[PDB]
Design a protein around this ligand. Structure first.
Ligand SMILES: *[C@@H]1O[C@H](CO)[C@@H](O)[C@H](O)[C@H]1NC(C)=O
Ligand SMILES: CN(C)S(=O)(=O)Nc1ccc(Cl)cc1
Ligand code: NA
Ligand code: NA
Lengths: 11, 250, 28
């Protein structure tokens, strides 16, 4: 449902 | 938000979305109170009856948003949490008394879309927290009890007399709560709904033309039901705790 | 913050949002 957010915020 | 409307751009620049990292999903609303501090409901972070007890690394906050689901490149900012602080007397066992929590963020850069809300002083609270006076609730929660918005929704709702709040529910209401919403006979409608909790109830002071966060979306029984009201954490009543946390850990 | 509660796209520019007047009218 949600657009993927930049990987940098999941590190 | 039920029976609200789309927010204008920059209408609620203190709005924050509490976002679960995995699975990626909306958890709650929240609000920006400084460049490093976000205010939300304790139950957004801790609710043992539903096996909810988030740690800092489970979560992100997304600030500056308008679209619910879009990654708003060059507009929103996404922040990691340094620390969660839950009110030590938050009552998750019974009635969500003292439903308040703080999250310390790196500072977020302010912009046209990102700006903190004020917290009330005693006098602004005494003056504005009166039955019939309206505040404004914002969020990305569901559009009805029984679906989901494209963009941030807004609704303005009147504070309700305490006996009417109490008489609408079997839950024990405390001084750390207030309720808001229209009465069945008032015609107009509107309420928070699932996904809005933790977000702000704000009022624009007519004295100094600033927005103050008087409430946090705390709980309700269904959404927008006739004869029911939304319940909000009384921010001013808990402000000494807020200040203690920010003074100690800020 | 000294600047809290003043929105860049509204108060800072002396522009009113579409429904803030409803709030003001309730403050009687
Ligand atoms: C929630 O999680 C923290 C950390 O794991 C834990 O220490 C705390 O006791 C938990 N709180 C409740 C009410 O379970
Ligand atoms: C009943 N809730 C879980 S809900 O669907 O989020 N509805 C609701 C309604 C009002 C308020 Cl303040 C908080 C929640
Ligand atoms: Na009752
Ligand atoms: Na209602």
């Amino acid at each position: 449902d949600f657009e993927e957010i930049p990987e940098e915020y999941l590190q | 938000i039920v029976e609200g409307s789309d927010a204008e751009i920059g209408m609620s620049p203190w709005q924050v979305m509490l976002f679960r990292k995995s699975p990626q999903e909306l958890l709650c609303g929240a609000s920006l109170i400084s460049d490093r501090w976000v205010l939300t409901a304790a139950h957004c972070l801790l609710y043992p009856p539903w096996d909810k007890n988030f740690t800092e690394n489970d979560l992100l906050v997304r600030i500056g948003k308008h679209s619910r689901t879009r990654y708003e490149r060059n507009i929103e900012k996404i922040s990691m949490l340094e620390k969660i602080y839950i009110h030590p007397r938050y009552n998750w066992r019974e009635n969500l008394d003292r439903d308040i929590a703080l999250m310390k963020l790196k500072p977020v850069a302010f912009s046209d879309y990102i700006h903190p809300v004020c917290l009330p002083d005693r006098e602004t609270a005494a003056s504005l927290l009166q039955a019939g006076y309206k505040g404004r609730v914002t969020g990305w929660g569901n559009l009805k009890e029984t679906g989901q918005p494209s963009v941030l929704q807004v609704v303005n709702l009147p504070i309700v007399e305490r006996p009417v709040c109490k008489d609408s529910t079997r839950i024990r209401i405390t001084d750390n709560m207030f309720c808001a919403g229209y009465k069945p006979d008032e015609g107009k409608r509107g309420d928070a709904c699932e996904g809005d909790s933790g977000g702000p109830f704000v009022m624009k002071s007519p004295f100094n033309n600033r927005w103050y966060q008087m409430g946090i979306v705390s709980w309700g029984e269904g959404c927008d039901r006739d004869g029911k009201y939304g319940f909000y954490t009384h921010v001013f009543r808990l402000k000494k705790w807020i200040q203690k946390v920010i003074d100690q850990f800020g | 913050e000294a600047d809290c509660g003043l929105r860049p796209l509204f108060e800072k520019k002396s522009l009113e949002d579409k429904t803030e007047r409803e709030l003001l009218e309730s403050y009687i």
